[PDB]
Amino acid sequence: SYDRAITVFSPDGHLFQVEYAQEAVKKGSTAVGVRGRDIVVLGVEKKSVAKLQDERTVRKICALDDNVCMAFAGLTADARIVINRARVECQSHRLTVEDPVTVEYITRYIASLKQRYTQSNGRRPFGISALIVGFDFDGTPRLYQTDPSGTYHAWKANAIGRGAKSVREFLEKNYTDEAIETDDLTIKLVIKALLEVVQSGGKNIELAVMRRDQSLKILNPEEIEKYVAEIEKEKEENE
Amino acid sequence: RYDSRTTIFSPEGRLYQVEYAMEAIGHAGTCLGILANDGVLLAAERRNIHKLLDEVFFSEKIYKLNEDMACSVAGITSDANVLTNELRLIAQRYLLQYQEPIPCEQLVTALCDIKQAYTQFGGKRPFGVSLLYIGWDKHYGFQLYQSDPSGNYGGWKATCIGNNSAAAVSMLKQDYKEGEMTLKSALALAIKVLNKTMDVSKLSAEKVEIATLTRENGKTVIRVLKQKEVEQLIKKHEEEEAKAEREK
Amino acid sequence: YDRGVNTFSPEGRLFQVEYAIEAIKLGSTAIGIQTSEGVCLAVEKRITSPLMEPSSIEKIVEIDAHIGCAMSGLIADAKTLIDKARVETQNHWFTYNETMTVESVTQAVSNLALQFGEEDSRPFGVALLFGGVDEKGPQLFHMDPSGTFVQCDARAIGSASEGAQSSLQEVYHKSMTLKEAIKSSLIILKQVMEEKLNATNIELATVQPGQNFHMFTKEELEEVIKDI
Amino acid sequence: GYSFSLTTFSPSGKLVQIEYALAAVAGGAPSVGIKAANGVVLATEKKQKSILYDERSVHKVEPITKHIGLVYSGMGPDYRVLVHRARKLAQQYYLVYQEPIPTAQLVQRVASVMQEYTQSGGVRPFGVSLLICGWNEGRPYLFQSDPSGAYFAWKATAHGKNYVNGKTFLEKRYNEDLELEDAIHTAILTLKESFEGQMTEDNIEVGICNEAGFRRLTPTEVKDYLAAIA
Amino acid sequence: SAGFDRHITIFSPEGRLYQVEYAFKAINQGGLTSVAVRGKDCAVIVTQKKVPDKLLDSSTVTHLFKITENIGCVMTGMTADSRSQVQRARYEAANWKYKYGYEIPVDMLCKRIADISQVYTQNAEMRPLGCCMILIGIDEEQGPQVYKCDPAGYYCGFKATAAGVKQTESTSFLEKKVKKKFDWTFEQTVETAITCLSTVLSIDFKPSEIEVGVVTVENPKFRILTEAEIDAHLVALAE
Amino acid sequence: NQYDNDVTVWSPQGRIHQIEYAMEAVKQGSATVGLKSKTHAVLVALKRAQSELAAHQKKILHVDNHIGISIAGLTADARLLCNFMRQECLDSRFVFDRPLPVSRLVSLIGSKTQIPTQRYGRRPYGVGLLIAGYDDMGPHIFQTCPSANYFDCRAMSIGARSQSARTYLERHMSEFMECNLNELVKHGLRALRETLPAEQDLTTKNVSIGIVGKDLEFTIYDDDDVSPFLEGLEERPQ
Amino acid sequence: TGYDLSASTFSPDGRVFQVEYAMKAVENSSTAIGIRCKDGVVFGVEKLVLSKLYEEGSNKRLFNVDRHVGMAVAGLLADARSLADIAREEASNFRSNFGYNIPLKHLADRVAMYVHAYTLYSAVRPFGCSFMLGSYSVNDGAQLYMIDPSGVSYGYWGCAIGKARQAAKTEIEKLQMKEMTCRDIVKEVAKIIYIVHDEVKDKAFELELSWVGELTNGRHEIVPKDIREEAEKYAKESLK
Amino acid sequence: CGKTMLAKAVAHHTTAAFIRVVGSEGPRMVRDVFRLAKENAPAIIFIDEIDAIATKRFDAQT
């Protein structure tokens, strides 16, 4: 009994179609998220804006809460589907529950939706993975990752997509156990990887920041290039 | 087998059926939306070729969703017809709720989400329709958008799909025009691209179907071009190529 | 005979659920011990990178103040089964005000598990240990994708189940103190399973009849570390 | 190939089964429909395989409304289904709007029906192609609706056996300024040109749309055009 | 060849519905012929009654049925499929009688039966019924009608027809009878039918071997002819 | 094979081999014995051991103060059927305060098990059941199989290695009719011991007993309860 | 193999070869016979014994259809039990609706439709059994109808199903059921069953008789053969 | 109807050799057929009821 299906097991017992979903995630572009001392920062790469393709429309970064933000790496159609579902869920939870939304609940929601969609015949799993950053961890930053197997884990700093093998090791090389003083330092550190992954072009670092109390914050390419120049000065020290 | 059903990925994670849908799109009659300012256009030469075809609508490629919204067709015919009708009902839903013209990006999403929902269920076939939208709204005004079978959507100032789509987009990138590139220059560039992509010498008026959106009185007007203006534009491009020869 | 459970082999066995047992085998190892002092459970995290929060992987959980759990397998739907167990305890206690017997909790989880060919999906490819205390006895119980379930004194599931089970069988007897059981289980885990004990990959949870609080082990492992 | 199922694409993005439906079309009885200047004429072949079959007891030209006529080239039962559906759809349009349904609207509704039969994994499309003749606001319309769910505008067309011969014939022998009588003459001429075997009152049947009303010609009139003429 | 005939809702490369022609084989059902002839004021059906074993009750093995005081029906096909089809005929006749206030015309009843057979033809849910039915009726001051109704969903009215073991021989014999100018009485019509059956079958035709149903404008009740009447006709054609 | 995937498909043999494969799945279960007298109906099950530190699995279930079962099959199917008998006896006691007769319960079991055996994509219920009861008409022992067939047996044994037990029951059928509860239960215990290999014999680990009588509610005796029944019974010499 | 895989597609040589497999299953079962005497209908069935384990008079194959309608079956036993259940349901439906006992022609035709319609659908299979129904209407006559797995319903003066269709019919053909009455019909039936392989190869079996007659009140009862066992004596005298 | 008959007649009257293969009879077979034709210069090849192999092309599955 070979894989050939979603709801059947090979004699080993692993659902290879879930593996195919995770490889479908692997074929997507880079996405590396972190949490800092107080703030959470993100920068997406591989914009590859081709002239008439005005880069704003595709919306590489989506903020779906009073304050929470992420798009989805993989195939973007299911990304926007989970976007609509996240909008509905966050607004409905804020309306119905005695207290507003927390990042843990919404991450569990996404994981459960992915699992429930997967757990049936004739229903394609979302081949999409995401990195969620939220503020209301009792007023503290925390980062989560969601995987098409319907799984959710917590990270101090994680990378998924085309750089998953590389950037993660980069993080394992330099994620300071010292809580990042001057969260702009964490922003420079993450911008370094977000650039170096895509040829450090300086054009696709498209970035968002939230200090775990603020609403959504965005970084324009010039202000991000400021952190890029600081990182270049830090790297030039070896002389 | 993997590609026999829409619910199965590749071991690489790819989905063959949507790829087959874009290969199908590769057949479609060449259609573009041109780069323009203070106006937009979506030229679509009709691939239908038989003198006994009556073209009683004068339009079989451009469908007006509203007097500030129009969309094209490149793909399966019945699927495109039902999808354009569904565009009309979704725009009617939004208008009947809010009494406000729908933003371009919101309608684009709603349709692409519906298409994706159809694809990702089993026992159902993905829509083999790629299509372009031109529209004006409160948030961004003049907009042209691309949509594919998988439910993807994107923003493009100028784009083309159908036969020789790669050639059309490549030459649009070659003679890219920006800024002062107003509507009439966009008509001229559409004439150029339709002449280059098609095999016909002295491009015939009945082979081409052209539409454009212009903000009249702030109420907006979408025109589907008649014979006379098409003849004038194509003849002008012919004599413009002659002028380009005059430099030699 | 490959499409699902609704096909029988020449020997009668269904060629779908044995693969779910092997799906148990691909998961992280998990251990459970039943003693008259308290019921204990242990689990290996397989923390992929310490940059993860080690507590994030919910491979050790508390269903309720008297009952804790561990699992091995695909993990993803194991959390769903823990959710069912928690809703079972909540509903039954709020209605009847009598404590749910851990036997009954396992029975309810089994009743959920029997919903892949018994109505109108696929077996839950994961196995579970429950450890609980009740007004009539402290018990430990085991659950597998087939929906059958058994009371055991010293149980092991997941990867390396056979060797860990052999050592656990050899160390067990009926009058052990929970301290000696815990130390024997931990040293077994150290020798056969991965490596020396540390807070970022091992987990222990124990429950006693007179204690409805702190059914976990947390931020106190240091005494063991120097004295294991 | 990719024909045993309808709801899956081919690698070339071809819905193979519906082209098999189109191949079922043009294997049936010949039929030709031409728009004149004033009227719209649809002619079809009705030879009985033997003297047993009663030529006056069955019809193939059908009035959906008193201003709409339908002719087909395919197996009969599916055509009966779509005739029933078209009649009910025209009547429901009349109930909704209190207006007689124009040709184009009825045509697109029937095309949408033939569309809804083009999906799912346990059904098949109709193996029939249809000519719709109609009068709307003083304008004559001829339309073709085909198993794919699409439809086309024709001043003249034909399908069935020897249909390419019909395309050539109406390409050569046609102009849009045709009077009604010459249009029916062209219709019988192309029917014969596609035809094999004799043709009389009992062998052919035709339907004419005129803006005042549509009607199916009696066998005697079909003979009057059919014989002693041409 | 194999593949376009394993399931019903599949078109062949030439567009052939294999299963329709395939069900057309079971119409053979060696043992019945069902020849029906129309005369100037009458409609006659005769079927061949091939009884394999003696112990069966003769009345139970009949193949002629009635759905209206003025409508007669006959069957050629699998007997169970036969009885199901005639039962659906009773269902439709009763519903039309209730809804419109008067009994269903024979042409509309053939249309309804062919409609259901076409319904099972177009949809893969249910097998098409392997049987062919023939109806005789009267319509007001305008004439007697003979109608054949087939599993393909096709139907037509005839001067005469026969779906039987000697298909082409019976049909050509009836054509030969009708392609020579003659009148049509009740006895003449029954004589034509009986001569067709006897000549195509060449058997000596004892009375129990055939069953005759009839309707006539002077007595529009549908009747099954008794053995005495059929033997009187047999000796009339014999002498 | 071409004709062995679903019960909806007949074989040219005039058989449904999938139903036979369900029978084989039943045979995979351990042996169980059932026997009745004019005084009591008793069933006994061979509880398969899993380890020296795990509970020997339960194979006799209690659903009614006068009705009991012994199973041999996939535990899920048998236990959900057990819930089905729970439902029917409870609703019968609701309807007319009657302890549900065993024969009609077994007939309902067969009728419900028949539905999967004739429909596509739904497994027939791969368990064999022995049912014991006492009712206003007599003592009753029935056996039910995935073919939805149900039988009444004065003595019966279903499961692996059963043939020796069935022969023993054939021999002692001439006894059971007028035997007393003690005689019947000891003969049933020996019937089970007939199944076992030479080195395996009756013990509290592997043995479960259930008894229904004209003067006692059907009770399942396990663990300590089994000890007095086995003690005093003849051991096995070689 | 061809296209004979389900009973919803016409296999080659249009006969499905599926419901014919159901008939093949019917042939595997033991014989049942049914006679109509001058004023009654009698059924006689043999049934295998499992072993000395088996409880006497168990899993018997005569079944009650209705207070006046009796059943005999052959083929798959459990399918026959389900058929008895649905037949009882149909009889109860008519009894509740019309307010009087159902004519056996109508009930037999409705059960024939049930079997036939079950033959069609792809998710289901034809019944692997064939059966006779018998009854007496004191108002006008007696009635018997036999139905096959295909749904074909016909009436008989004498009929047989099982592993000995034609041989049993030869045995029955030379009885005088034309005028003979049921009291010796039971003896004739028992001896006829014993004639066709009573215990020649199959070691032991049980013989069960059912009856519906005006002298039997026209209701359905199991014949009290415990009374002096005259039919049993006759059937065992059949030895030579 | 005489499709093979007239071909055979032509083969007899002319100096040609007549090689025949029916379409029901993979590509190596066609190669061998044309090669065996090459061995005799005036020889004729005949395909009988070819249509089975020459049926309209499309996306092939198996």
Side-chain angles (χ1 to χ4, degrees), chain A residues 3 17 20 54 56-57 59 76 78 80 117 122 124, chain B residues 2 9 105 113 116 120 122 140 151-153 155 157:
Chain A
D3 44 284
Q17 207 62 217
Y20 295 3
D54 56 326
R56 177 211 68 90
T57 64
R59 189 167 48 260
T76 64
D78 300 7
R80 207 177 61 257
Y117 215 46
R124 188 220 305 151
Chain B
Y2 291 152
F9 299 121
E105 218 177 325
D113 318 310
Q116 186 292 329
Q120 183 159 339
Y140 292 103
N152 274 274
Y153 94 101
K157 290 183 168 179

mmCIF file of all heavy atoms in Angstrom, chain A residues 3 17 20 52 54 56-57 59 76 78 80 117 122 124, chain B residues 2 9 105 113 116 120 122 140 151-153 155 157, unseen atoms left out:
data_model
loop_
_atom_site.group_PDB
_atom_site.id
_atom_site.type_symbol
_atom_site.label_atom_id
_atom_site.label_comp_id
_atom_site.label_asym_id
_atom_site.label_seq_id
_atom_site.Cartn_x
_atom_site.Cartn_y
_atom_site.Cartn_z
ATOM 1 N N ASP A 3 1.618 5.448 -1.004
ATOM 2 C CA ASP A 3 0.919 6.618 -0.484
ATOM 3 C C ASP A 3 -0.357 6.923 -1.260
ATOM 4 O O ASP A 3 -1.458 6.673 -0.762
ATOM 5 C CB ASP A 3 1.851 7.832 -0.506
ATOM 6 C CG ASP A 3 2.642 7.940 -1.799
ATOM 7 O OD1 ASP A 3 3.612 7.172 -1.973
ATOM 8 O OD2 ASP A 3 2.291 8.791 -2.643
ATOM 9 N N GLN A 17 1.373 12.363 2.065
ATOM 10 C CA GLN A 17 0.776 13.571 1.506
ATOM 11 C C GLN A 17 1.024 14.777 2.402
ATOM 12 O O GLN A 17 1.183 15.901 1.909
ATOM 13 C CB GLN A 17 -0.717 13.363 1.261
ATOM 14 C CG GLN A 17 -1.278 14.233 0.145
ATOM 15 C CD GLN A 17 -0.638 13.950 -1.202
ATOM 16 O OE1 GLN A 17 -0.411 14.862 -1.996
ATOM 17 N NE2 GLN A 17 -0.344 12.682 -1.465
ATOM 18 N N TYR A 20 4.301 15.816 1.352
ATOM 19 C CA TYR A 20 4.207 16.583 0.115
ATOM 20 C C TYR A 20 3.767 18.010 0.398
ATOM 21 O O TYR A 20 4.232 18.946 -0.258
ATOM 22 C CB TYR A 20 3.241 15.904 -0.859
ATOM 23 C CG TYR A 20 3.683 14.538 -1.357
ATOM 24 C CD1 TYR A 20 4.856 13.946 -0.902
ATOM 25 C CD2 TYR A 20 2.917 13.838 -2.281
ATOM 26 C CE1 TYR A 20 5.251 12.701 -1.350
ATOM 27 C CE2 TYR A 20 3.307 12.593 -2.737
ATOM 28 C CZ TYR A 20 4.474 12.030 -2.270
ATOM 29 O OH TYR A 20 4.865 10.791 -2.722
ATOM 30 N N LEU A 52 5.933 46.585 -14.253
ATOM 31 C CA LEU A 52 4.503 46.836 -14.095
ATOM 32 C C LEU A 52 3.917 46.129 -12.881
ATOM 33 O O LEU A 52 2.820 46.490 -12.441
ATOM 34 C CB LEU A 52 3.746 46.412 -15.353
ATOM 35 N N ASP A 54 3.459 46.253 -9.621
ATOM 36 C CA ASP A 54 3.601 47.097 -8.443
ATOM 37 C C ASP A 54 3.524 46.237 -7.186
ATOM 38 O O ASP A 54 2.546 45.514 -6.973
ATOM 39 C CB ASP A 54 2.536 48.193 -8.447
ATOM 40 C CG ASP A 54 1.131 47.644 -8.533
ATOM 41 O OD1 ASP A 54 0.937 46.608 -9.201
ATOM 42 O OD2 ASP A 54 0.218 48.273 -7.960
ATOM 43 N N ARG A 56 3.048 46.521 -4.086
ATOM 44 C CA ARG A 56 2.121 46.695 -2.971
ATOM 45 C C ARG A 56 0.969 45.697 -3.023
ATOM 46 O O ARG A 56 0.519 45.202 -1.983
ATOM 47 C CB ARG A 56 1.581 48.126 -2.963
ATOM 48 C CG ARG A 56 0.550 48.386 -1.882
ATOM 49 C CD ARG A 56 -0.456 49.429 -2.326
ATOM 50 N NE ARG A 56 -1.303 48.926 -3.401
ATOM 51 C CZ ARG A 56 -2.451 48.290 -3.213
ATOM 52 N NH1 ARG A 56 -2.921 48.057 -1.999
ATOM 53 N NH2 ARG A 56 -3.143 47.873 -4.269
ATOM 54 N N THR A 57 0.484 45.384 -4.228
ATOM 55 C CA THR A 57 -0.785 44.673 -4.369
ATOM 56 C C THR A 57 -0.755 43.278 -3.757
ATOM 57 O O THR A 57 -1.718 42.876 -3.096
ATOM 58 C CB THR A 57 -1.168 44.579 -5.844
ATOM 59 O OG1 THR A 57 -0.190 43.797 -6.541
ATOM 60 C CG2 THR A 57 -1.239 45.962 -6.455
ATOM 61 N N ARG A 59 0.682 42.078 -1.300
ATOM 62 C CA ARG A 59 0.556 42.151 0.156
ATOM 63 C C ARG A 59 1.315 41.006 0.833
ATOM 64 O O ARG A 59 0.732 40.083 1.406
ATOM 65 C CB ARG A 59 -0.920 42.171 0.574
ATOM 66 C CG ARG A 59 -1.162 42.459 2.051
ATOM 67 C CD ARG A 59 -2.627 42.778 2.350
ATOM 68 N NE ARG A 59 -3.555 41.826 1.748
ATOM 69 C CZ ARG A 59 -4.231 42.038 0.625
ATOM 70 N NH1 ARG A 59 -4.109 43.167 -0.053
ATOM 71 N NH2 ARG A 59 -5.049 41.092 0.173
ATOM 72 N N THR A 76 0.000 31.015 -2.426
ATOM 73 C CA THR A 76 -0.595 32.194 -1.803
ATOM 74 C C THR A 76 -2.117 32.135 -1.775
ATOM 75 O O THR A 76 -2.750 32.890 -1.028
ATOM 76 C CB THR A 76 -0.129 33.458 -2.524
ATOM 77 O OG1 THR A 76 -0.600 33.441 -3.875
ATOM 78 C CG2 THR A 76 1.392 33.537 -2.524
ATOM 79 N N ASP A 78 -4.133 29.583 -0.724
ATOM 80 C CA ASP A 78 -4.491 29.123 0.612
ATOM 81 C C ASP A 78 -4.057 30.130 1.669
ATOM 82 O O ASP A 78 -4.681 30.230 2.732
ATOM 83 C CB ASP A 78 -3.875 27.753 0.881
ATOM 84 C CG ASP A 78 -4.342 26.706 -0.105
ATOM 85 O OD1 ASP A 78 -5.033 27.076 -1.077
ATOM 86 O OD2 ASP A 78 -4.013 25.516 0.085
ATOM 87 N N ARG A 80 -4.291 33.417 1.377
ATOM 88 C CA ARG A 80 -5.390 34.373 1.465
ATOM 89 C C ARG A 80 -6.656 33.734 2.023
ATOM 90 O O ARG A 80 -7.466 34.418 2.663
ATOM 91 C CB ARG A 80 -5.656 34.980 0.092
ATOM 92 C CG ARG A 80 -6.267 36.370 0.118
ATOM 93 C CD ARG A 80 -6.416 36.897 -1.297
ATOM 94 N NE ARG A 80 -7.290 36.023 -2.067
ATOM 95 C CZ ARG A 80 -6.862 35.143 -2.962
ATOM 96 N NH1 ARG A 80 -5.584 35.063 -3.295
ATOM 97 N NH2 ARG A 80 -7.732 34.306 -3.516
ATOM 98 N N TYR A 117 -9.131 20.410 8.023
ATOM 99 C CA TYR A 117 -9.217 20.361 6.567
ATOM 100 C C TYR A 117 -8.481 19.141 6.033
ATOM 101 O O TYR A 117 -8.949 18.468 5.109
ATOM 102 C CB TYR A 117 -8.615 21.630 5.964
ATOM 103 C CG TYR A 117 -9.308 22.130 4.711
ATOM 104 C CD1 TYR A 117 -10.683 22.204 4.655
ATOM 105 C CD2 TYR A 117 -8.595 22.634 3.651
ATOM 106 C CE1 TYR A 117 -11.331 22.696 3.535
ATOM 107 C CE2 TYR A 117 -9.242 23.124 2.529
ATOM 108 C CZ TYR A 117 -10.594 23.148 2.471
ATOM 109 O OH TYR A 117 -11.226 23.646 1.359
ATOM 110 N N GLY A 122 -10.721 13.699 -0.160
ATOM 111 C CA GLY A 122 -11.112 14.694 -1.139
ATOM 112 C C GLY A 122 -11.048 16.123 -0.660
ATOM 113 O O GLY A 122 -11.894 16.934 -1.043
ATOM 114 N N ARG A 124 -7.981 18.987 -0.062
ATOM 115 C CA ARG A 124 -6.552 19.248 -0.128
ATOM 116 C C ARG A 124 -6.093 20.028 1.102
ATOM 117 O O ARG A 124 -6.720 21.027 1.477
ATOM 118 C CB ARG A 124 -6.219 20.030 -1.398
ATOM 119 C CG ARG A 124 -4.746 20.192 -1.679
ATOM 120 C CD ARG A 124 -4.452 21.590 -2.201
ATOM 121 N NE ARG A 124 -5.240 21.949 -3.375
ATOM 122 C CZ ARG A 124 -5.591 23.191 -3.679
ATOM 123 N NH1 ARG A 124 -5.245 24.214 -2.916
ATOM 124 N NH2 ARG A 124 -6.306 23.413 -4.779
ATOM 125 N N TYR B 2 -1.373 10.590 -9.203
ATOM 126 C CA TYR B 2 -1.298 11.926 -8.619
ATOM 127 C C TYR B 2 -2.147 12.938 -9.386
ATOM 128 O O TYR B 2 -3.063 13.548 -8.823
ATOM 129 C CB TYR B 2 0.160 12.384 -8.549
ATOM 130 C CG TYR B 2 1.023 11.634 -7.559
ATOM 131 C CD1 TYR B 2 2.389 11.503 -7.764
ATOM 132 C CD2 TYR B 2 0.479 11.089 -6.405
ATOM 133 C CE1 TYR B 2 3.187 10.833 -6.860
ATOM 134 C CE2 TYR B 2 1.270 10.416 -5.492
ATOM 135 C CZ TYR B 2 2.622 10.291 -5.725
ATOM 136 O OH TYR B 2 3.414 9.624 -4.822
ATOM 137 N N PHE B 9 -0.860 16.459 -4.272
ATOM 138 C CA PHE B 9 0.335 17.209 -4.624
ATOM 139 C C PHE B 9 1.340 16.320 -5.344
ATOM 140 O O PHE B 9 1.146 15.112 -5.500
ATOM 141 C CB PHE B 9 1.016 17.794 -3.385
ATOM 142 C CG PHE B 9 0.174 18.760 -2.612
ATOM 143 C CD1 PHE B 9 -0.126 18.518 -1.285
ATOM 144 C CD2 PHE B 9 -0.284 19.927 -3.198
ATOM 145 C CE1 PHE B 9 -0.885 19.408 -0.559
ATOM 146 C CE2 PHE B 9 -1.045 20.822 -2.477
ATOM 147 C CZ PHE B 9 -1.343 20.562 -1.155
ATOM 148 N N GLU B 105 -9.658 45.648 -5.365
ATOM 149 C CA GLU B 105 -8.943 44.549 -4.728
ATOM 150 C C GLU B 105 -9.884 43.639 -3.949
ATOM 151 O O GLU B 105 -9.658 42.425 -3.888
ATOM 152 C CB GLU B 105 -7.846 45.105 -3.820
ATOM 153 C CG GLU B 105 -6.568 44.284 -3.824
ATOM 154 C CD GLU B 105 -5.471 44.899 -2.976
ATOM 155 O OE1 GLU B 105 -5.385 46.144 -2.921
ATOM 156 O OE2 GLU B 105 -4.691 44.135 -2.370
ATOM 157 N N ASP B 113 -10.814 33.849 -4.005
ATOM 158 C CA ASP B 113 -11.114 32.946 -2.897
ATOM 159 C C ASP B 113 -12.176 31.926 -3.282
ATOM 160 O O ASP B 113 -12.056 30.742 -2.944
ATOM 161 C CB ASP B 113 -11.561 33.731 -1.662
ATOM 162 C CG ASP B 113 -10.733 34.978 -1.423
ATOM 163 O OD1 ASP B 113 -9.490 34.875 -1.418
ATOM 164 O OD2 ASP B 113 -11.326 36.062 -1.238
ATOM 165 N N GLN B 116 -10.466 29.405 -5.532
ATOM 166 C CA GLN B 116 -9.595 28.530 -4.754
ATOM 167 C C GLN B 116 -10.414 27.498 -3.990
ATOM 168 O O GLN B 116 -10.047 26.319 -3.927
ATOM 169 C CB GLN B 116 -8.741 29.380 -3.805
ATOM 170 C CG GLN B 116 -7.658 28.654 -3.000
ATOM 171 C CD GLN B 116 -8.192 27.695 -1.955
ATOM 172 O OE1 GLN B 116 -9.261 27.907 -1.384
ATOM 173 N NE2 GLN B 116 -7.443 26.635 -1.695
ATOM 174 N N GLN B 120 -9.820 23.445 -4.284
ATOM 175 C CA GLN B 120 -9.194 22.652 -3.231
ATOM 176 C C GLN B 120 -10.111 21.542 -2.725
ATOM 177 O O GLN B 120 -9.636 20.595 -2.089
ATOM 178 C CB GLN B 120 -8.715 23.579 -2.107
ATOM 179 C CG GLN B 120 -7.975 22.876 -0.989
ATOM 180 C CD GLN B 120 -7.103 23.812 -0.183
ATOM 181 O OE1 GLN B 120 -6.743 24.887 -0.645
ATOM 182 N NE2 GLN B 120 -6.679 23.349 0.984
ATOM 183 N N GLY B 122 -12.314 18.136 -3.420
ATOM 184 C CA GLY B 122 -12.269 17.016 -4.333
ATOM 185 C C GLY B 122 -13.561 16.843 -5.107
ATOM 186 O O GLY B 122 -14.597 17.428 -4.791
ATOM 187 N N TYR B 140 -7.976 53.348 -4.457
ATOM 188 C CA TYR B 140 -6.824 53.416 -5.345
ATOM 189 C C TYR B 140 -7.147 53.882 -6.757
ATOM 190 O O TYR B 140 -6.216 54.080 -7.543
ATOM 191 C CB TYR B 140 -6.130 52.048 -5.412
ATOM 192 C CG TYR B 140 -5.461 51.643 -4.119
ATOM 193 C CD1 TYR B 140 -6.046 50.711 -3.275
ATOM 194 C CD2 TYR B 140 -4.246 52.199 -3.740
ATOM 195 C CE1 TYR B 140 -5.441 50.338 -2.090
ATOM 196 C CE2 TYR B 140 -3.632 51.834 -2.558
ATOM 197 C CZ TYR B 140 -4.234 50.904 -1.737
ATOM 198 O OH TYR B 140 -3.626 50.537 -0.559
ATOM 199 N N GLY B 151 -6.496 30.765 -8.071
ATOM 200 C CA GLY B 151 -6.992 31.759 -7.145
ATOM 201 C C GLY B 151 -5.976 32.811 -6.780
ATOM 202 O O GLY B 151 -6.204 33.579 -5.841
ATOM 203 N N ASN B 152 -4.847 32.852 -7.479
ATOM 204 C CA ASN B 152 -3.870 33.904 -7.268
ATOM 205 C C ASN B 152 -4.336 35.198 -7.926
ATOM 206 O O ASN B 152 -5.084 35.196 -8.908
ATOM 207 C CB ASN B 152 -2.511 33.492 -7.831
ATOM 208 C CG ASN B 152 -1.692 32.690 -6.844
ATOM 209 O OD1 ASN B 152 -0.975 33.250 -6.016
ATOM 210 N ND2 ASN B 152 -1.795 31.370 -6.926
ATOM 211 N N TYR B 153 -3.880 36.316 -7.370
ATOM 212 C CA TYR B 153 -4.157 37.620 -7.950
ATOM 213 C C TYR B 153 -2.960 38.529 -7.734
ATOM 214 O O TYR B 153 -2.209 38.381 -6.767
ATOM 215 C CB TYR B 153 -5.418 38.261 -7.357
ATOM 216 C CG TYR B 153 -5.164 39.194 -6.193
ATOM 217 C CD1 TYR B 153 -5.160 40.572 -6.369
ATOM 218 C CD2 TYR B 153 -4.914 38.697 -4.922
ATOM 219 C CE1 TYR B 153 -4.929 41.428 -5.310
ATOM 220 C CE2 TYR B 153 -4.683 39.545 -3.856
ATOM 221 C CZ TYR B 153 -4.690 40.909 -4.058
ATOM 222 O OH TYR B 153 -4.456 41.759 -3.002
ATOM 223 N N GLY B 155 -1.224 42.730 -8.915
ATOM 224 C CA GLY B 155 -1.375 44.046 -9.510
ATOM 225 C C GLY B 155 -0.360 44.254 -10.620
ATOM 226 O O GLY B 155 0.836 44.031 -10.433
ATOM 227 N N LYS B 157 0.485 47.093 -13.893
ATOM 228 C CA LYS B 157 0.166 48.270 -14.694
ATOM 229 C C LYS B 157 -0.110 47.894 -16.143
ATOM 230 O O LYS B 157 -0.986 48.489 -16.782
ATOM 231 C CB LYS B 157 1.304 49.288 -14.610
ATOM 232 C CG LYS B 157 1.438 49.957 -13.252
ATOM 233 C CD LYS B 157 2.531 51.013 -13.267
ATOM 234 C CE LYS B 157 2.471 51.889 -12.027
ATOM 235 N NZ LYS B 157 3.554 52.911 -12.019
#
